[PDB]
Amino acid sequence: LPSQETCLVEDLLYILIGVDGRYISVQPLVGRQSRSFSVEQNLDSSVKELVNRILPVATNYSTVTRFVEENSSFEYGQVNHALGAAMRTLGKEYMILISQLEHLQRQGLLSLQKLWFYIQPTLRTMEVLASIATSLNKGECFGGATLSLLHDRTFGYTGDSQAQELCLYLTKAASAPYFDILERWIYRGIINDPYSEFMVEEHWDQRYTIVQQQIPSFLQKVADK
Amino acid sequence: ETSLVRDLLYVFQGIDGKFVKMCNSENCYKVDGKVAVSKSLKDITSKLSELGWLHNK
């Protein structure tokens, strides 16, 4: 068993990276970014169930990171692209812990339990990122409509400090593009629309007519202002 | 000896290891199925059992 547990630690370690392993095969049946994970039958059925609940973690890693590269490839100037950059640099912090414990894998004695503790914080990081990504697939918003959705997630994710800190940072990384498009409209009146990020479209006419499609992080009173 | 050391790990991490305790509303402390072994195998599983209920909760 303990040699069988350690190769199920190493095969799972490749699953969290995003590549398909040897004893655990990955297959997407659905248009959603989450792919299904199948563990093979083992000589002991206990560890097969214990590895089975760590497979929802790479379910959430494969959820948000496919979204931010699809957002990046099908090129937009939108705030949804800058949203994916805040999620990509958080992926640098996720991939760097996995390589550090692999230095302890050449001295390999690490457990199914020492690994299980580090994955419950990093299922937390990935489940919030997956549940933002799952809301963005059902939503199809852009511009200020994305800004007001991320402003609502600063309200709801309060009570957990570190889920609040990323939902703050995701809102702040979506607003610094948007309020720069605000300020570039204030100093000259340069209205540029790659995919109509800002609300106000160019019209004698006096027809700037905010839009009901988008709204800032605040209510319509600052949009009228 | 050492297989019982490995067996308590998989229940510490989650659901059961080398043998199958499962019966979470029927608890029999673990299955070992051995009577020729010492009767202290009957009590080392009692300490093994009060932690797995707090793991699944």
Radius of gyration for the alpha carbons in chain A, expressed in angstroms and rounded? 22
Question: Inter-chain contact B9–A111, Cβ cutoff 8 Å?
Answer: yes
Sign for the CA dihedral angle at B6, B9, B14, B19 comes to positive
Q: Which whole-number Å values give the CA distances from A102 to A12, A98, A107, A110, A135, in the listed order?
A: 13, 7, 9, 10, 34
Determine the length of chain B: 57
- Kindly list the residues from chain B whose CB atom is less than 8 angstroms away from the CB atom of residue A50: 10, 13-15, 17
Report the residue count for chain A.
225
DSSP E strands in chain A: the ranges are 24-27, 36-39
CB contact under 8 A, B18 and A46: yes
Contacts with A47 from chain B: Cβ below 8 Å:
10, 17
Whole-angstrom Cα distance, residue A22 to residue A39? 10
> Residue B6 is nearest to which of A2, A45, A53, comparing CB atoms?
A2
Resolution for this PDB entry, in angstroms = 17.0
Residue with tokens 């009228």: A224
Hunting for tokens 């705030």 — which residue is that? A79
Task: Say how far apart CA A177 and CA B50 lie, in whole Å.
Answer: 53
Interface list for chain B against chain A, based on CB atoms closer than 8 Å: 3, 6-7, 9-20
CA of A119 vs chain B CAs: smallest distance (Å): 11
Is residue A100 within 8 angstroms of chain B, CB to CB? Answer: no
Q: Which of B30, B35, B36, B34 is nearest to B15 (CA)?
A: B30
Instruction: Tell me how far apart the alpha carbons of residues A84 and A170 are, in angstroms, rounded to a whole number.
Output: 9
